[PDB]
Design an enzyme around this catalytic site. Structure first.
Site, PDB file in Angstrom:
ATOM      1  CB  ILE A   1      16.220  23.719   0.484  1.00 38.64           C
ATOM      2  CG1 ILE A   1      15.577  23.697  -0.918  1.00 38.64           C
ATOM      3  CG2 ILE A   1      15.965  22.462   1.280  1.00 38.64           C
ATOM      4  CD1 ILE A   1      16.212  22.693  -1.844  1.00 38.64           C
ATOM      5  CB  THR A   2      12.474  23.432   4.599  1.00 35.13           C
ATOM      6  OG1 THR A   2      13.300  23.870   5.690  1.00 35.13           O
ATOM      7  CG2 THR A   2      12.834  22.014   4.194  1.00 35.13           C
TER       8      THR A   2
ATOM      9  CG  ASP B   1      21.790  21.537  12.533  1.00 35.42           C
ATOM     10  OD1 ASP B   1      22.453  22.567  12.870  1.00 35.42           O
ATOM     11  OD2 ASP B   1      20.569  21.369  12.862  1.00 35.42           O
TER      12      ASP B   1
ATOM     13  N   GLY C   1      20.217  29.035   5.119  1.00 31.34           N
ATOM     14  CA  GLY C   1      19.857  28.448   6.398  1.00 31.34           C
ATOM     15  C   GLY C   1      20.136  29.368   7.566  1.00 31.34           C
TER      16      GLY C   1
ATOM     17  CD  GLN D   1      15.991  32.225  15.246  1.00 30.34           C
ATOM     18  OE1 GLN D   1      14.964  32.253  14.582  1.00 30.34           O
ATOM     19  NE2 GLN D   1      16.472  33.306  15.883  1.00 30.34           N
TER      20      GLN D   1
ATOM     21  CB  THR E   1      19.646  40.521   6.772  1.00 38.62           C
ATOM     22  OG1 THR E   1      18.557  41.215   7.358  1.00 38.62           O
ATOM     23  CG2 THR E   1      20.716  40.342   7.866  1.00 38.62           C
TER      24      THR E   1
ATOM     25  CD  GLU F   1      16.407  43.443  11.318  1.00 37.67           C
ATOM     26  OE1 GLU F   1      16.340  43.486  12.569  1.00 37.67           O
ATOM     27  OE2 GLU F   1      15.853  44.256  10.577  1.00 37.67           O
TER      28      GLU F   1
ATOM     29  CE1 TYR G   1      18.638  36.551  11.033  1.00 39.42           C
ATOM     30  CE2 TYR G   1      18.448  38.921  10.810  1.00 39.42           C
ATOM     31  CZ  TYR G   1      18.486  37.662  10.239  1.00 39.42           C
ATOM     32  OH  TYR G   1      18.367  37.528   8.888  1.00 39.42           O
TER      33      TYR G   1
ATOM     34  CE  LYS H   1      21.189  35.723   8.495  1.00 39.07           C
ATOM     35  NZ  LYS H   1      21.444  34.757   7.403  1.00 39.07           N
TER      36      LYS H   1
HETATM   37  N1  LIG Z   1      12.879  36.965   4.372  1.00 40.39           N
HETATM   38  C1  LIG Z   1      13.505  38.133   4.591  1.00 40.39           C
HETATM   39  O1  LIG Z   1      12.858  39.176   4.644  1.00 40.39           O
HETATM   40  C2  LIG Z   1      15.030  38.117   4.692  1.00 40.39           C
HETATM   41  C3  LIG Z   1      15.828  39.215   4.300  1.00 40.39           C
HETATM   42  C4  LIG Z   1      17.223  39.154   4.358  1.00 40.39           C
HETATM   43  C5  LIG Z   1      17.780  37.980   4.807  1.00 40.39           C
HETATM   44  N2  LIG Z   1      17.019  36.945   5.234  1.00 40.39           N
HETATM   45  C6  LIG Z   1      17.745  35.762   5.598  1.00 40.39           C
HETATM   46  O2  LIG Z   1      17.536  35.018   4.384  1.00 40.39           O
HETATM   47  C7  LIG Z   1      17.528  33.638   4.620  1.00 40.39           C
HETATM   48  C8  LIG Z   1      16.218  33.065   4.136  1.00 40.39           C
HETATM   49  O3  LIG Z   1      15.117  33.728   4.748  1.00 40.39           O
HETATM   50  P1  LIG Z   1      13.710  32.979   4.898  1.00 40.39           P
HETATM   51  O4  LIG Z   1      12.618  34.006   5.088  1.00 40.39           O
HETATM   52  O5  LIG Z   1      13.621  31.951   3.789  1.00 40.39           O
HETATM   53  O6  LIG Z   1      13.928  32.229   6.318  1.00 40.39           O
HETATM   54  P2  LIG Z   1      13.064  31.035   6.901  1.00 40.39           P
HETATM   55  O7  LIG Z   1      11.757  30.844   6.172  1.00 40.39           O
HETATM   56  O8  LIG Z   1      13.039  31.261   8.378  1.00 40.39           O
HETATM   57  O9  LIG Z   1      13.992  29.760   6.511  1.00 40.39           O
HETATM   58  C9  LIG Z   1      15.103  29.389   7.329  1.00 40.39           C
HETATM   59  C10 LIG Z   1      15.677  28.097   6.775  1.00 40.39           C
HETATM   60  O10 LIG Z   1      16.901  27.805   7.445  1.00 40.39           O
HETATM   61  C11 LIG Z   1      16.801  26.536   8.047  1.00 40.39           C
HETATM   62  N3  LIG Z   1      17.592  26.373   9.278  1.00 40.39           N
HETATM   63  C12 LIG Z   1      17.373  26.906  10.473  1.00 40.39           C
HETATM   64  N4  LIG Z   1      18.266  26.496  11.383  1.00 40.39           N
HETATM   65  C13 LIG Z   1      19.109  25.671  10.733  1.00 40.39           C
HETATM   66  C14 LIG Z   1      20.271  24.855  11.105  1.00 40.39           C
HETATM   67  N5  LIG Z   1      20.684  24.906  12.375  1.00 40.39           N
HETATM   68  N6  LIG Z   1      20.872  24.133  10.142  1.00 40.39           N
HETATM   69  C15 LIG Z   1      20.431  24.101   8.850  1.00 40.39           C
HETATM   70  N7  LIG Z   1      19.329  24.790   8.445  1.00 40.39           N
HETATM   71  C16 LIG Z   1      18.671  25.583   9.336  1.00 40.39           C
HETATM   72  C17 LIG Z   1      15.296  26.339   8.280  1.00 40.39           C
HETATM   73  O11 LIG Z   1      14.926  24.989   8.474  1.00 40.39           O
HETATM   74  P3  LIG Z   1      13.539  24.605   9.220  1.00 40.39           P
HETATM   75  O12 LIG Z   1      12.491  24.649   8.100  1.00 40.39           O
HETATM   76  O13 LIG Z   1      13.831  23.215   9.680  1.00 40.39           O
HETATM   77  O14 LIG Z   1      13.279  25.545  10.355  1.00 40.39           O
HETATM   78  C18 LIG Z   1      14.751  26.915   6.996  1.00 40.39           C
HETATM   79  O15 LIG Z   1      14.923  26.044   5.867  1.00 40.39           O
HETATM   80  C19 LIG Z   1      17.770  33.531   6.107  1.00 40.39           C
HETATM   81  O16 LIG Z   1      19.170  33.411   6.280  1.00 40.39           O
HETATM   82  C20 LIG Z   1      17.302  34.836   6.701  1.00 40.39           C
HETATM   83  O17 LIG Z   1      17.981  35.139   7.908  1.00 40.39           O
HETATM   84  C21 LIG Z   1      15.682  36.965   5.136  1.00 40.39           C
HETATM   85  C1  LIG Z   2      15.184  41.422   6.455  1.00 35.22           C
HETATM   86  C2  LIG Z   2      14.797  40.835   7.789  1.00 35.22           C
HETATM   87  O1  LIG Z   2      13.366  40.693   7.757  1.00 35.22           O
HETATM   88  C3  LIG Z   2      12.805  40.069   8.890  1.00 35.22           C
HETATM   89  O2  LIG Z   2      13.135  40.753  10.011  1.00 35.22           O
HETATM   90  P1  LIG Z   2      12.062  41.844  10.814  1.00 35.22           P
HETATM   91  O3  LIG Z   2      12.219  43.136  10.098  1.00 35.22           O
HETATM   92  O4  LIG Z   2      12.273  41.787  12.275  1.00 35.22           O
HETATM   93  O5  LIG Z   2      10.639  41.192  10.452  1.00 35.22           O
HETATM   94  P2  LIG Z   2       9.280  41.053  11.289  1.00 35.22           P
HETATM   95  O6  LIG Z   2       8.193  40.881  10.298  1.00 35.22           O
HETATM   96  O7  LIG Z   2       9.401  40.094  12.418  1.00 35.22           O
HETATM   97  O8  LIG Z   2       9.183  42.506  11.952  1.00 35.22           O
HETATM   98  C4  LIG Z   2       8.976  43.698  11.171  1.00 35.22           C
HETATM   99  C5  LIG Z   2       8.589  44.828  12.100  1.00 35.22           C
HETATM  100  O9  LIG Z   2       7.226  44.644  12.564  1.00 35.22           O
HETATM  101  C6  LIG Z   2       7.198  44.831  13.959  1.00 35.22           C
HETATM  102  N1  LIG Z   2       6.061  44.092  14.520  1.00 35.22           N
HETATM  103  C7  LIG Z   2       4.955  44.669  15.113  1.00 35.22           C
HETATM  104  N2  LIG Z   2       4.133  43.801  15.665  1.00 35.22           N
HETATM  105  C8  LIG Z   2       4.715  42.572  15.395  1.00 35.22           C
HETATM  106  C9  LIG Z   2       4.294  41.291  15.698  1.00 35.22           C
HETATM  107  O10 LIG Z   2       3.296  41.012  16.360  1.00 35.22           O
HETATM  108  N3  LIG Z   2       5.152  40.305  15.208  1.00 35.22           N
HETATM  109  C10 LIG Z   2       6.312  40.545  14.505  1.00 35.22           C
HETATM  110  N4  LIG Z   2       7.020  39.485  14.107  1.00 35.22           N
HETATM  111  N5  LIG Z   2       6.737  41.769  14.211  1.00 35.22           N
HETATM  112  C11 LIG Z   2       5.902  42.735  14.676  1.00 35.22           C
HETATM  113  C12 LIG Z   2       8.581  44.396  14.460  1.00 35.22           C
HETATM  114  O11 LIG Z   2       8.892  44.902  15.757  1.00 35.22           O
HETATM  115  C13 LIG Z   2       9.473  44.968  13.355  1.00 35.22           C
HETATM  116  O12 LIG Z   2       9.880  46.318  13.579  1.00 35.22           O
HETATM  117  C14 LIG Z   2      13.304  38.633   8.990  1.00 35.22           C
HETATM  118  O13 LIG Z   2      12.956  37.951   7.787  1.00 35.22           O
HETATM  119  C15 LIG Z   2      14.826  38.624   9.166  1.00 35.22           C
HETATM  120  O14 LIG Z   2      15.410  37.341   9.005  1.00 35.22           O
HETATM  121  C16 LIG Z   2      15.522  39.552   8.186  1.00 35.22           C
HETATM  122  O15 LIG Z   2      16.681  39.353   7.848  1.00 35.22           O
END
Ligand SMILES: NC(=O)c1ccc[n+]([C@@H]2O[C@H](COP(=O)([O-])OP(=O)(O)OC[C@H]3O[C@@H](n4cnc5c(N)ncnc54)[C@H](OP(=O)(O)O)[C@@H]3O)[C@@H](O)[C@H]2O)c1
Ligand SMILES: C[C@H]1O[C@H](OP(=O)(O)OP(=O)(O)OC[C@H]2O[C@@H](n3cnc4c(=O)[nH]c(N)nc43)[C@H](O)[C@@H]2O)[C@@H](O)[C@@H](O)C1=O
Ligand SMILES: NC(=O)c1ccc[n+]([C@@H]2O[C@H](COP(=O)([O-])OP(=O)(O)OC[C@H]3O[C@@H](n4cnc5c(N)ncnc54)[C@H](OP(=O)(O)O)[C@@H]3O)[C@@H](O)[C@H]2O)c1
Ligand SMILES: NC(=O)c1ccc[n+]([C@@H]2O[C@H](COP(=O)([O-])OP(=O)(O)OC[C@H]3O[C@@H](n4cnc5c(N)ncnc54)[C@H](OP(=O)(O)O)[C@@H]3O)[C@@H](O)[C@H]2O)c1
Ligand SMILES: NC(=O)c1ccc[n+]([C@@H]2O[C@H](COP(=O)([O-])OP(=O)(O)OC[C@H]3O[C@@H](n4cnc5c(N)ncnc54)[C@H](OP(=O)(O)O)[C@@H]3O)[C@@H](O)[C@H]2O)c1
Ligand SMILES: C[C@H]1O[C@H](OP(=O)(O)OP(=O)(O)OC[C@H]2O[C@@H](n3cnc4c(=O)[nH]c(N)nc43)[C@H](O)[C@@H]2O)[C@@H](O)[C@@H](O)C1=O
Ligand SMILES: C[C@H]1O[C@H](OP(=O)(O)OP(=O)(O)OC[C@H]2O[C@@H](n3cnc4c(=O)[nH]c(N)nc43)[C@H](O)[C@@H]2O)[C@@H](O)[C@@H](O)C1=O
Ligand SMILES: C[C@H]1O[C@H](OP(=O)(O)OP(=O)(O)OC[C@H]2O[C@@H](n3cnc4c(=O)[nH]c(N)nc43)[C@H](O)[C@@H]2O)[C@@H](O)[C@@H](O)C1=O
Lengths: 342, 337, 341, 341
Positions: free
Chosen positions: C9-10, C55, C78, C80, C124, C126, C148, C152
């Site tokens: 939620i955070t 957790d 939730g 990493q 995801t 990913e 990761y 997942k």
């Molecule tokens: N954003 C994207 O582009 C994208 C796309 C597809 C899927 N996802 C997935 O979608 C979900 C939400 O993404 P998001 O961008 O909102 O991620 P985020 O901002 O990194 O949020 C992660 C959340 O999970 C919590 N968390 C981490 N470790 C935990 C543990 N051990 N126990 C309980 N809670 C824990 C974090 O708490 P803290 O605040 O304490 O760190 C935070 O509330 C994630 O599962 C991510 O992998 C993201």
């Molecule tokens: C849907 C998916 O979305 C996210 O995963 P991600 O695609 O790895 O996101 P990102 O923003 O870290 O990287 C995007 C691209 O950008 C490149 N890139 C270049 N230069 C930097 C750089 O300096 N930092 C970062 N972080 N990326 C960089 C990097 O190498 C990659 O190819 C997470 O929310 C994940 O939880 C999830 O599920």
């Protein structure tokens, strides 16, 4: 209704406790680890009042499922990685099973709504005293663990106390000193000696190696000690107890007495890792010392004072050291005669 | 210098692999779980072999063992391998079969051996689960059907990731069902062979099974461990299906097993009321119990090992009829003694 | 009765989802990690919302929370979630993102909710990693490329198994990259928008990135949390890709972000020596550092959300150009008010 | 060569210790948890300091960090440190605070540093729990009263075991309660100082506490981190109690805090119906809620630091009245600048 759940039912103590409770008309349930081979050798003779369930003290969900199904009146947490030497290289696994596993089982009781109906026995240990702070050791002697096993069991001791004090769980720590039997694991010193001496008597072995010959222990019989576990759960109040003989012997004496039972007198020569035990009659070397069997932090001496148990439980040890040694050596001679690969 | 480290050395496959490698002059090291009782029954006849206490859930113990052994080959056969048990031990199964594979790979890397060791992962036809192609080959999409399958799928992909990220010579053996007289008693083939043996000896009258219509590709473990070694002799690290390509049902395993003790089973009834009856005597010897069903069954497996045949020159030697005969004969002798 | 339990939620998504559900009259419960510092910045404005310490690595805490809350809907957000960090925190990532999903599902079953609750898993893009089809849809084979992704993938399949084995209403949202002004600063889009904002305000001259040629399908988190809820309103539990279908490079994100502060970036050099220079002034504003590369990159993602459009009537509302504008403008305002933000 | 590795660097103590060691010319490395939000608020002013992502539950990450850093001193301050939270997060607390200490010690050994590094463990007066002697000293028997205390007891003894088994220079700092303006808001002292500050500024009217009669030995964290360093400068690895030896109740902390904003609290009622009222205005500013009680309270702590005084030349410098004044004044300034802080 008397329904016991035993973790560690496949082990030495679990096997004796199961028999003890079955004789009293209990419904007995045990948690058994999945194994690639048969691991129920100690209990297979009991085979409709005993039921076995797959589980592990590292898997909280499985514990909740088992406790919910069984609804035990008594829980005996005997499950553990119990080997002290092995604990030095398997320290984290030992912590997770022996320490955190105790927490998992207690939390499972609470989760299942049984905090007021179950009585919980924890398998505590004289290893908690480690580098002994008083001689003899009693319930009020401060703890000083000397291995990852001792540290893990110390966590378990105190988390049990916390569930008792926080939630009024009837939970007790049995602080049991070393106890042995013909069912003792082969890797513990007493059974290692009795098995090896038996093989020497039968001509199947010439020599075996030990570690620290000068370690001193308070050794009783497991069959006597499982009765104390049950007695602690029959007590009106949940209290912790030392269970022990109060008599001390060295590893060296266990070796000497074991060889006397096959008609040999061991005579020692040399010092430290070069010490050897020699047959007086023939001059053959039967015992050597190897540093690989030493522990980095030894527990040199244990001697328990079970005054509290004697007074409150009417418990007393029945088997003394000389009879323990005789029983183990005779049992292993018979075992090895019937089957040289046993 | 040929030094193998085998996790799961006490299991069916580990025991055959240890013998296979010892015959080739390897120094063989195994990781054995601490047990309250003797657990080295399959390998005690071999003790060039050294055993080490460890567990796939304890990272430090793995690093200590690998650092001491400095293996040239690692075979990760250690697992909670029972599919039915995985439904009630799902987390333990994940931690051992999935995360444990990561722990062993990380231990290799920690020990500085990423460029020197060859790593074999015990993958499985359970990865195909609800099969997406018939037959199944290396490129058939995975569809796991249990916590065991899911955990093994994690392990498959983390192995691929170490190979691609760090150039670890690491391979997935995608092995279809393989059996032997050393097979765990709780697997269907050994359960049948043991039970049929007991019936022949008058020690049992009847036993119950679950899904009689499940179909499997069954080979012999002794043949399959050779394929594991062959995969690590390959010039490039590649993944391979290992299988017979021949399919039989649980029902056929039962029929053939009873024929080897001189009985013909005749089936009557349906579903959980189906029974197997001796034709000669009319005695009921097989019943069905829903408690042996899996919530999500794997109905059908048939492997295509063309790639292994071409690249490794591997072929199965033991066929199904001989497998059944060997298991039933071994269990008659075992149960008589 | 509408009672949601949100893990994560955070985080970015959790914060938007909480707002979305609160607007619909839900009672919203969140699991928050214990922290030595304040960690509720994205949701503090909302505190019908209750927070619980927990957790995803502690099974008993999950059972206790579910028993207390009695949710009708569970959203497992939730994780990493950082892909680069997952290479050095591989085991922690497995335990939280993979095994933690199992722990939450087992807690549902333990609590007797297998037939009553609806469960959303945060899957995801990913999962597709080294993409086996372009574009990627629900039937595209998975090929994860990090710890990761592997974690997942476990989570995806254990969710499928609970659905098939026990008839749990459980779904995998296969969400492609989604961003917002609330995006973690360590993700590439927010790193760019924050850095560009600082450059505009004179608080920074230059910043470094990793792989400029990576291509992503980027949408807005606020749109995507609606899809999560829609998946749980569906009559049958099905898995869905949620995506825009439009692809841009990291390089393009940088170019468009700088255009919003009135600069045209011109590139010179190759690989780790490539730099981005202001056309008007010649100042170097972007460099490349190999420490931001991943050992096994995910080069290209493009989602096909046809199934969601047909079954959920969902469509993305925010397109790439608007996403970039919103993030840069939000960070200019944030950094102007507070240079240490 | 002076190179310190601090686990728990983002926490109260880690932040003061980092400053203390940097002033002495150390190269300082910290392990920071991945977070979805900024979590380095206490140390951001310092960023020679280098931060590394890690977790005390991930053994491989600890080995990688230690191997790279090659520290001469390790301070294990990382923990789930909240006692109340430990009752519902008991397993997580065990894994981090107990087993995590083992993981860090084994990482030292794995990295070949058993004979070169000095290791400080963050032990605690919570080990004494239901106190067996008054005052408590190094030889007072332990009696923990929470899952936190039990986990820390494991950690205390596994540290002793590495020292005795392998001749690791490893020590247990048995530190009694220590506070500061950087104290976590969920601990009683900071909860009071923040709440009183808000009342003074008109941002709050009333707040609730649990057990007003608990008695603690409270010192200042800035003094106590110096003791940690002093323990690693000692010629022999020894365990030490670090404390003030002066005892006050939670009730007294409340009274003194309100006096600093010009109010005299007068108590009426008993148990969960007790309230604290402004003498001048009659407004209720403090109430009691049973949800803040612990199932097994630690009623009384008073440390005897004679050994540390004699061997380390350590003495507490900040006394209780100054501690309270500093915390209330710091929170008035914090809340005046920013009402949402
Ligand atoms: N954003 C994207 O582009 C994208 C796309 C597809 C899927 N996802 C997935 O979608 C979900 C939400 O993404 P998001 O961008 O909102 O991620 P985020 O901002 O990194 O949020 C992660 C959340 O999970 C919590 N968390 C981490 N470790 C935990 C543990 N051990 N126990 C309980 N809670 C824990 C974090 O708490 P803290 O605040 O304490 O760190 C935070 O509330 C994630 O599962 C991510 O992998 C993201
Ligand atoms: C849907 C998916 O979305 C996210 O995963 P991600 O695609 O790895 O996101 P990102 O923003 O870290 O990287 C995007 C691209 O950008 C490149 N890139 C270049 N230069 C930097 C750089 O300096 N930092 C970062 N972080 N990326 C960089 C990097 O190498 C990659 O190819 C997470 O929310 C994940 O939880 C999830 O599920
Ligand atoms: N005997 C003594 O002198 C003595 C004295 C005081 C205290 N203790 C403690 O008393 C208890 C019983 O002693 P013992 O001599 O009977 O021990 P043992 O023979 O070593 O038996 C240990 C039992 O615990 C089981 N176990 C191990 N790991 C487990 C896990 N992860 N989950 C579930 N079960 C697990 C073992 O199963 P497997 O058979 O599958 O290995 C076995 O049934 C132990 O807790 C020991 O530490 C022993
Ligand atoms: N046989 C098949 O048809 C087949 C096909 C494809 C893949 N597989 C996979 O192939 C491998 C070998 O199969 P198998 O038939 O030989 O299995 P098995 O007989 O069940 O042997 C499993 C082995 O792994 C060990 N093990 C279990 N948990 C462990 C842990 N926590 N740490 C360390 N070791 C542990 C077992 O020790 P204990 O003896 O102490 O239990 C045993 O040595 C397994 O990974 C299995 O999943 C099997
Ligand atoms: N202050 C006292 O009165 C006192 C007295 C005696 C002993 N102690 C102990 O002394 C140490 C420091 O106290 P404190 O007041 O500074 O505590 P704190 O403010 O709560 O700091 C805890 C620190 O540990 C980190 N941490 C938590 N879980 C972790 C994990 N799984 N892996 C790695 N790091 C983790 C936290 O990170 P996040 O910022 O990400 O949460 C934070 O940096 C703790 O061990 C505490 O239990 C405190
Ligand atoms: C009550 C307590 O009892 C047991 O713990 P233990 O006392 O370590 O038992 P043990 O038989 O391994 O060692 C006894 C003594 O004998 C010494 N010793 C010499 N030479 C060898 C030798 O070769 N092997 C072994 N094993 N010990 C040897 C060894 O160094 C030690 O001083 C467990 O049941 C434990 O679970 C428990 O709780
Ligand atoms: C390759 C793969 O191979 C093995 O996995 P498995 O195929 O599940 O093996 P099994 O012998 O347990 O089941 C085979 C079939 O037989 C059916 N069946 C019917 N009635 C009973 C019955 O009573 N018991 C059992 N066990 N199965 C039964 C059962 O439902 C299934 O359809 C493992 O080595 C595994 O580790 C592995 O990787
Ligand atoms: C040395 C030791 O120091 C700390 O542990 P602690 O003493 O539990 O700290 P605390 O500030 O949470 O509680 C002090 C007392 O205050 C009482 N109390 C009343 N009312 C509320 C109340 O509302 N909140 C809190 N938190 N406590 C309250 C509460 O019941 C207790 O008796 C940690 O740094 C720990 O890591 C550590 O090692």
């Amino acid at each position: 209704r008397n329904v016991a759940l035993i973790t560690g039912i496949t082990g030495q103590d679990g096997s004796y406790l199961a028999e003890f409770l079955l004789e009293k008309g209990y419904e007995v349930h045990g948690i058994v680890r999945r194994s690639s081979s048969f691991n129920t050798g100690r209990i297979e003779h009991l085979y409709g009042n005993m039921k076995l369930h797959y589980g592990d003290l590292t898997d909280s969900t499985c514990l909740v499922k088992i406790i919910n199904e069984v609804k035990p009146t008594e829980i005996y947490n005997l499950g553990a990685q119990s080997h002290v030497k092995i604990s030095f290289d398997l320290a984290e696994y030992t912590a997770d099973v022996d320490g955190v596993g105790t927490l998992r089982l207690l939390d499972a009781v609470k989760t299942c709504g049984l905090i007021n109906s179950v009585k919980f026995y924890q398998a505590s240990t004289s290893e908690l005293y480690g580098k002994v702070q008083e001689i003899p050791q009693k319930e009020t002697t401060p703890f000083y663990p000397r291995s990852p096993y001792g540290a893990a069991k110390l966590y378990a001791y105190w988390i049990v106390v916390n569930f008792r004090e926080a939630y009024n769980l009837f939970a007790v720590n049995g602080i049991l000193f070393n106890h042995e039997s013909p069912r003792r694991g082969a890797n513990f010193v007493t059974r290692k000696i009795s098995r090896s001496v038996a093989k020497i008597y039968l001509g199947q072995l010439e020599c075996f190696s030990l570690g620290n010959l000068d370690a001193k222990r308070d050794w009783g019989h497991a069959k006597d000690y499982v009765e104390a576990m049950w007695l602690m759960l029959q007590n009106d109040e949940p209290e912790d107890f030392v269970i022990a003989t109060g008599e001390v012997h060295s590893v060296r004496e266990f070796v000497e007495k074991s060889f006397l039972h096959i008609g040999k007198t061991i005579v020692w020569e040399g010092k430290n890792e070069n010490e050897v035990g020699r047959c007086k009659e023939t001059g053959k070397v039967h015992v050597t010392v190897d540093l690989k069997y030493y522990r980095p932090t030894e527990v040199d001496f244990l001697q328990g004072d079970c005054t509290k148990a004697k007074q409150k439980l009417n418990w007393k040890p029945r088997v003394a050291f000389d009879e323990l040694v005789r029983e183990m050596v005779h049992a292993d001679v018979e075992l090895m005669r019937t089957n040289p690969n046993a």
